[PDB]
Amino acid sequence: KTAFIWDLDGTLLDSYEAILSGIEETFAQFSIPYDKEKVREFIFKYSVQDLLVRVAEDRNLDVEVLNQVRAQSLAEKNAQVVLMPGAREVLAWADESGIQQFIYTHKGNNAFTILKDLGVESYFTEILTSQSGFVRKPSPEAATYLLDKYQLNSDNTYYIGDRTLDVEFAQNSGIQSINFLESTYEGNHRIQALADISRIFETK
């Protein structure tokens, strides 16, 4: 019957302070001045990779070295990662309901460590990270793999996320979407909170 494929950051995981701490440590190693608010505003308007790019271009540093120190430092801040509100409750609900649960994340293998630290790793049948080999969302290949392997029903398979690229991933792979954002995609179901998800699966 039903399958959820989950995003992590902003959906299940609140990695905000861990990411900022990771960036602060990385900036200290390269002698880059660190202002939390300016970093906060940049990564919200753009992305963490764009921030690395900006300082690499501006300060003549090697972006890949920046990114490897970033990944490394981020992995040291796992203690600062907190679940999003309602995340434990929806995971438990889905599990009890017999919904099969998966992850596709742009995070690396450290995603496994975090989920184990938070006590939620055992919910997932398979966890796909940036080490999986698949092209980043919204490229569909990761989802197609899960459909093919687990014999999932595209009408009852939902990618759950918080960004437009998460809706696109669902659309590109022919599956349904549950998302904080509105979309013109017919298979999107907009939520205001994680607690709304269970309400999708009962009469109105």
Residues that bind Mg ion (CB under 5 A): 7, 9-10, 162
C-alpha distance from residue 89 to each of 82, 101, 200 (Å) = 14, 14, 15
Residue 193 CB, shortest distance to Mg ion, in Å, is: 15
**Binding site residues, Cl ion, CB under 5 A:** 8-9, 19, 48, 105-106, 119, 121-122, 135-137
Closest alpha carbon to 194 in 171, 145, 160 = 160
**Interacting partner of 10 out of Cl ion, Mg ion, none (Cβ under 5 to 8 A depending on kind):** Mg ion
Q: Looking at beta carbons only, is 47 or 153 nearer to Cl ion?
A: 47
What residues pair up with 161 in beta bridges, in sequence order? 179
C-alpha distance from residue 116 to each of 16, 73, 110, 124, 166 (Å) = 18, 18, 10, 11, 24
Q: Looking at beta carbons only, is 7 or 168 nearer to Mg ion?
A: 7
Q: Looking at beta carbons only, is 4 or 27 nearer to Mg ion?
A: 4
Burial of 89 (0-12, 13-18, 19+ CB in 10 A): middle
**Interacting partner of 31 out of Mg ion, Cl ion, none (Cβ under 5 to 8 A depending on kind):** none
- d(CA 128, CA 104) in angstroms, rounded, equals 5
Q: Looking at beta carbons only, is 55 or 167 nearer to Mg ion?
A: 167
**Interacting partner of 48 out of Mg ion, Cl ion, none (Cβ under 5 to 8 A depending on kind):** Cl ion
Q: Looking at beta carbons only, is 10 or 86 nearer to Mg ion?
A: 10
Residue 192 CB, shortest distance to Cl ion, in Å, is: 20
Q: 3-state DSSP call for residue 86?
A: coil
**Interacting partner of 137 out of Cl ion, Mg ion, none (Cβ under 5 to 8 A depending on kind):** Cl ion
Residue nearest to Mg ion (CB): 10
The DSSP code for 80 is: G
